[PDB]
């Protein structure tokens, strides 16, 4: 129908909106702490501690499959990644503080985001 194509016209247009957010909200962590999941090698454990692991690898693939059908989903997965990473995490490690300078730096780029959405309707 013409409408489903509409439709997917609209999705289309929200994930080149997000795929743009994701470029944003990575380039806060030039360390790259959060870009590939915890390896289940090198932390055995972390799924004993972890229910729902999540990255910017993983959520860029989730990302061009097209599948965020809103921001909402899309902020819970960054969510994730950071709240994942403060309670595996000691509040004086590397990892605990690049999740709060993530999660403060990203803000202003999902409030935009959150507002575009909004107002160009996807």
């Given at each position: ?51 729902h692991?999540m ?21 819970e997965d960054?969510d994730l990644i950071?709240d994942n ?38």
């Open positions: 129908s013409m409408e489903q194509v509409a439709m997917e016209l609209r999705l289309t247009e929200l994930t080149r909106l997000l795929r743009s957010v994701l470029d944003q909200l990575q380039d806060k962590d030039p360390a790259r702490i959060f870009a590939q999941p915890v390896s289940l090698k090198e932390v055995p454990d972390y799924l004993d501690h972890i229910k692991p990255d910017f690898a993983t959520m860029r693939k989730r990302l061009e499959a097209q599948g965020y059908k809103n921001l909402h989903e899309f902020e960054f950071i990473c403060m309670k595996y995490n000691a509040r004086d490690t590397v990892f605990y503080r690049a999740a709060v300078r993530l999660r403060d730096q990203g803000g202003v780029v999902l409030r935009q985001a959150r507002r575009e959405v909004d107002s160009i309707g996807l």
